[model samples]
Target: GSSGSSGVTWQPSKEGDRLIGRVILNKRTTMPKDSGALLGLKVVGGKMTDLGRLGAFITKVKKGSLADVVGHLRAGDEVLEWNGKPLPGATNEEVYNIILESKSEPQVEIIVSRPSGPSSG
Candidate 1:
């Protein structure tokens, strides 16, 4: 029989120095159209799976690039929350859509989460 483990818990990738404050880490960029605030980042899924169902790890923040200015996103930076939305159950398309909701703007607020720590949200 396949039964669910009631005691099982779900948490972020890491387990220290969490971002409970949900720091805005707001930043801005200037690129053509809205693409600057969307793609070109080396990212992967937020879960154990590398499918990128939701959230993303900024593997490489291309310097001298529009996306680079975004929250100063670095290699270790993980995009846990975007615009107040969590990425655990989100999709790439889903996240991008919300990113666009801000529209016509260049700023992006990426709430970073550590390997393990806080952020009850």
Candidate 2:
């Protein structure tokens, strides 16, 4: 991560100051697996909702992918949790790590909100 207003300066810390030994730095871009599901939750007015019919709708589901295997999730589905943690304002890396570190079946449990009323009917 860069620092300063110009963005040219690097972030300085005590670790950098005390560099008396060899240091190893690894960097890589982590892309979500096409065959994996990203557990997502929905929030409305600060409340968790059920998996609505819209939840099953898929905004973008690549063919032969994991999401496609389980059916593409829609925008309306309110994701309640991911690997037993509330999912809101979570970064892509965090979500990626959760999937990467999981020891169980690679699957996301989504709590969807079923739409009601005549409009949906």
Candidate 3:
């Protein structure tokens, strides 16, 4: 899985000092038309896979969905936080609930660490 071009903009961390060499990013984008509409991004990890060490990674991004419209948020991006909530050891259902809790808002923000290279799937 990987990422593709989109209109989403990622900003540098403004919270504190720059840390390690990992590529970290922050994406803030509008939510779907309604809370019932899916966010269009899949998360996998937590207690289910070895990847859990890095929290959850986006497994899929549905086309024509908000995630696709936003762009940078895609598969292969390791999610560290969502709306300030940590996800390093959360369950899949837990992550879903977290998203569900925030979809009612007009916009959402996600913090993720991705590989350093040309963006593509």
Candidate 4:
């Protein structure tokens, strides 16, 4: 519902492809200082796509995983931007490294596009 400096704006395709999403995230929500972000959390980016969409798209969230604990990311939701960085230019791993920066990071506002629908209005 929100956009950071590097956040990507979702666009509709004439072909009507499957809808993607953007969701906000923060270190306190996804991981903890004692630990960190878990495995299997991947973004749909290596370089950039036509959609200009990238970041940790909520592809899979274990029932009680850290993401679940985060309580914001849902399946199909995208972690488009973190704090003030966009997900596009960076690879998935790169993005992870940026966010899981020692778990010392403060609350980061993550912006993601909602799947199957327009932004929350």
Candidate 5:
């Protein structure tokens, strides 16, 4: 990704013992309209970590505010229903449309992997 100005770079960090890596970006002026309540979605690298790796994962809704409320969605939640209609595909534009079409606060039902693990929170 093109770093704007902040000059932050993607690198590995030592979180205790596990090596956690992240893509850092240079600070840039974000559109004021895009602030607060907007989940900034980006397509990153790695076949094992990219959106394509999530296969059918897609945005399902934008409730309360146009921000992520559920926090961490399941590891492989493929968004299936948006306001009751089947999602055509995991497209960003389609997701935005779903948000725009909501009469009330938007909520979506996503099909995610039920991995064997304890739920957070």
Candidate 6:
């Protein structure tokens, strides 16, 4: 028997050897002012054997930030695309700029991929 509150219904979908997630984030969910800190997050770049190329991975999410409240945007998740553009092989600076420019819109959608497993601890 089970009963619970409504929660985030969409979990990352497994594709091949990776878990892919399509997340739509609200940039100002917790923030009071409009700014460039879309998702209020940090990212890093490195070779992703799964992707067969370099890719951007989220490293951190600020407390009380939009990404934090969304609750499914994991830190180890690989950011594959923004809006609809692919981010494979993009440098951290480019990814940074993408987040920066994302401020133009209140909502941002991103596609991220991670290895098939539990959250990195």
lDDT (CA) per prediction: 0.48, 0.33, 0.56, 0.50, 0.32, 0.63
On lDDT, the leading prediction is 6
Q: Give RMSD to native, each candidate.
A: 12.5, 19.7, 8.2, 7.5, 15.0, 6.8
Candidate 4, residues 8-91: lDDT per residue as tens digits?
Answer: 234543455644333333333444333344322444545445577444565565565434544435666666565567766778
Question: Per-residue lDDT for 84 in model 2?
Answer: 51
Q: Which stretches of candidate 3 lie over 4 Å from their true place?
A: 1-7, 11-37, 45-54, 119-121
lDDT of 3: 0.56
Tens-digit lDDT track of model 3 for 1-121: 2233324555444442321112222234444454332367776645343543537677777787655665446677776776567767777778767766665544455667644454478
lDDT tens per residue, model 6, 27-96: 4343444544556667665436363777887777777665566646767777778756566777666766
Per-residue accuracy of model 5 over 27-87 as CA lDDT, tens digit each: 2233245432223232111113233332234233334222233333323344334335444
Off by over 4 Å in 1: 1-30, 33-36, 39-54, 64-70, 116-121
Task: Give per-residue CA lDDT, model 1, range 1-121, as digits (tens).
Answer: 2222111122344443443223232234434543535533554543343443555556666675434543344576566666566755766666565656644443444555554543488
Candidate 2 per-residue lDDT, tens place, 1-121, comes to 4221210112223444321111111112323554233322222323322422211222343554333334344444343344354444454455445444432333333332223321444
Candidate 1 clash pair list: 14-115, 14-116, 15-115, 15-116, 15-117, 16-116, 16-117, 18-118, 20-119, 45-52
lDDT of 6 at 2: 22
Sort all candidates by lDDT, best to worst: 6, 3, 4, 1, 2, 5
Please give the range of 10 consecutive residues that has the lowest summed lDDT in model 5: 18-27
CA displacement after TM-score superposition, residue 121 of candidate 6 (Å): 12
Candidate 2 wrongly placed segments (more than 4 Å): 1-33, 36-58, 62-72, 103-108, 113-121
- TM-score of each predicted structure versus truth: 0.49, 0.33, 0.58, 0.49, 0.30, 0.67
- How far is 52's C-alpha from truth in model 5 (Å)? 11
Model 4 worst lDDT window (10 residues): 1-10
